[PDB]
């Protein structure tokens, strides 16, 4: 009856909330990584460029 004890203890609910928060936070890290690369590309461009064209196509 481990699933029952997990539920009645409150830890089922908390574990589920924590897994969803981890998912969200990993999604946000992927968004940040892409934004980092786009920013760096944009800054590089202002100081060279057609490297923008590849992205903006």
């Amino acid at each position: 009856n481990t699933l029952v004890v997990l539920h009645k203890s409150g830890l089922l609910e908390i574990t589920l909330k924590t897994k969803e928060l981890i998912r969200q936070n990993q999604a946000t890290q992927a968004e940040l990584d892409q934004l980092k690369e786009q920013t760096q590309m944009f800054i590089e461009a202002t100081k060279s460029w057609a490297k923008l064209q590849a992205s903006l196509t």
Partner: protein, 42 residues
């Protein structure tokens, strides 16, 4: 050259807008985190 400044400023403004969107998502995550931590201090 005014035209170029406005184009790059349009790019800059969209990237800045992205930072603000991501910031709001993290603020919401921080509030969910606080609630989980409170439940873990049963």
């Amino acid at each position: 050259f005014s035209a170029q400044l406005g184009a790059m400023q349009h790019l800059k403004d969209q990237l800045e807008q992205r930072t603000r969107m991501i910031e709001a998502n993290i603020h919401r995550q921080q509030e969910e985190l606080r609630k989980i931590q409170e439940q873990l201090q049963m």
